[PDB]
Amino acid sequence: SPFPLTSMDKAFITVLEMTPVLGTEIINYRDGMGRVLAQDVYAKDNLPPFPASVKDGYAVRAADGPGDRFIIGESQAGEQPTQTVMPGQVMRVTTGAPIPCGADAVVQVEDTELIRESDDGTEELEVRILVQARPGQDIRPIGHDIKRGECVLAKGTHMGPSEIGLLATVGVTEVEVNKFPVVAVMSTGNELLNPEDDLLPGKIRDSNRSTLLATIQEHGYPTINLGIVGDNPDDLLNALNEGISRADVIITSGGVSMGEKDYLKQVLDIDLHAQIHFGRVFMKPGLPTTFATLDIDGVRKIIFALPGNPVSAVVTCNLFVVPALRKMQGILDPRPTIIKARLSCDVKLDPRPEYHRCILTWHHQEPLPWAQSTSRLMSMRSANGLLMLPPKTEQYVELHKGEVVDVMVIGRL
């Protein structure tokens, strides 16, 4: 029947509550960007694993105090020194080099004066130490940064470049992570042609498939292109069955209003036997947005049947689909970032919550960004926000330039 109007808050919670978290797999750490760890990661070595110089200078005995010293040799990075530093002696050290036995502090070269070098001038022989070194000064002790057996990354961690670096550091080059969802995208309608086609009478080009696939790809998830499907229940069923076989998530657009050749809801329920959780949402745009799940064996497939209007499709994809994908790939709090911004122009409110693509810009020293709903130069930039306008009331019927509003971040700022 005509599905109940579902509130935006209920629809959103329903998507998150009903979306599964995918299983795990082992990956190479270099492939970890944007992955969520499904294991704790432990250090199997100390960092540094030897006492290491913080400075270019000399390894000394602090008890020697300031004075003139014989340079017995050099500790070079990458090699364990063999000599022991005795009273009256020092060893040259470079940053990251091991501290030799017998030394207990480092004096940086700027707190020294060279006395004697070799004739060719390539070897230092004697040096004046000008300061009283503090015990342990300018040395990183064994384990100062990381200790053997320390947990350096917890399960649940959403990895960026520095986490990949940490895995490299501790030598943990394979890790268990959640899988990424595979997302299949289909367009529907007898009027649709491919982008590559010249127009024919009564027809237009399919843009949603491209826009949706790009949106998903921007977030790093693998995609499947299911093409254009006609307004025909058998064709829709066959396409959905392909999507279900090939992917974790199916996204369709078009054919979800109550029109005569809108078949998707019927096919989902009667033919595919999916559970439709909502089929209308009280929102602008996006009224006919539909969310269904299908359990086959012990696997839950998710299906988003988005409106056909191109603006509606991209808006609802960002509101509903992206957070579900984030939950599927193991992100613990998959909610989008919502920031406060100032309206750049007056806006009339609707009885429905309204959503509009916008561009966020910071002005000089002003603390809040401005939100400009999509000058010449502005066109050089792609939308990076979704303005989230409140429903109207007897009190508030309009918002004014400068008033503070919620904006969901949808692109790299």
In the complex, minimum distance from the CB of residue 307 to ligand ADP, in angstroms, rounded to a whole number: 4
* Helical spans, DSSP H, in 252-293: 264-266
Contacts of 168 (CB under 8 A, 6+ apart): 29
- Work out what residue 310 binds among Ca ion, ligand ADP, W ion, none; the CB cut-off runs from 5 to 8 Å by kind: ligand ADP
Tally of helices (H runs) and strands (E runs) in the chain: 7, 29
**Total residues at interface with W ion (CB under 5 A):** 2
Work out whether 285 is an interface residue with ligand ADP (CB under 6 A): no
- Closer residue to ligand ADP (CB): 261 or 401: 261
* Residues between 26 and 45 that touch a second copy (CB under 8 A): 29-30, 32-33, 45
Alpha helices in 101-226 (DSSP H): 161-170, 208-218
Q: How far apart are CA 207 and CA 310, in angstroms?
A: 7
Cα-Cα-Cα-Cα torsion 255, 259, 264, 266, nearest 10 degrees, comes to: 180
Minimum separation from the CB atom of position 304 to Ca ion (A): 16
**Which structure tokens are listed for 382?**
């792609």
- Residue nearer to a second copy on the CB measure, 244 or 267: 267
Residue 318: closest CA among 355, 351, 343: 355
Residue 259 binds ligand ADP (CB under 6 A): yes
Q: Which helix (H) or strand (E) holds 117?
A: strand 112-117
Under rule CB under 5 A, residue 287 binds W ion: yes
Q: Does 354 bind a second copy (CB under 8 A)?
A: no
Total interface residues for ligand ADP by CB under 6 A: 23
Of 33, 124, 38, the residue nearest 74 (C-alpha): 124
Binding to W ion by residue 5, rule CB under 5 A? no
Q: Per rule CB under 8 A, is residue 97 in the interface with a second copy?
A: yes
Residue 235's SS3 state is: helix
Q: Give the contact letters, 60-89, x = binds to a second copy (CB under 8 A), - = no.
A: --------------x-xxxxx---------
CB 70 within 8 A of CB 126: yes
The SS3 call for residue 165 is: helix
* Residue 6 token pair: 């579902």
The entry of Mg ion, Ca ion, ligand ADP, none that residue 207 binds, CB within 5 to 8 Å by partner kind: ligand ADP
Contact code string over 234-253 relative to ligand ADP, x by CB under 6 A: -------------------x
Number of residues that bind a second copy (CB under 8 A): 100
Residue 284: CB minimum distance to W ion, A: 5
Q: Does 257 bind Mg ion (CB under 5 A)?
A: yes
DSSP secondary structure string for all residues of 300-355: EEEEEEE-SSHHHHHHHIIIIIHHHHHHHTT-SS-PPPEEEEEESS-EE--SS-EE
CA distance 220 to 15: 20
Residues 153-192 that bind ligand ADP (CB under 6 A): 187, 189, 191-192
- Taking the alpha carbons at both ends of the chain, their separation in whole angstroms is 42
Stretch that binds Mg ion, among 170-178, 259-267, 292-300, 381-389 (CB under 5 A): 259-267
Q: Among residues 256, 281, 360, 407, which is the contact residue for ligand ADP, using CB under 6 A? A: 256
**How do beta strands 67-75 and 89-93 pair?**
parallel
Smallest gap from Cβ 322 to a second copy, in A, equals 11
Instruction: Evaluate whether 354 touches 389 at the Cβ level (below 8 Å).
Output: yes
Residue closer to a second copy (CB basis): 6 or 253? 253
Smallest gap from Cβ 54 to ligand ADP, in A, equals 8
Return the half-sphere exposure (C-beta side, CA atoms, 13 A cut-off) of residue 371.
Answer: 31
- The footprint of ligand ADP on residues 191-220 (CB under 6 A) is 191-192, 204, 206-209
189 binds, among ligand ADP, Mg ion, W ion, none (CB under 5 to 8 A by kind): ligand ADP
Interaction site with ligand ADP (CB under 6 A): 95-96, 187, 189, 191-192, 204, 206-209, 253-257, 259, 262, 288, 307-310
What residues line the site for Mg ion (CB under 5 A)? 95, 257, 259, 262
Which residues form the interface with W ion (CB under 5 A)?
Answer: 285, 287
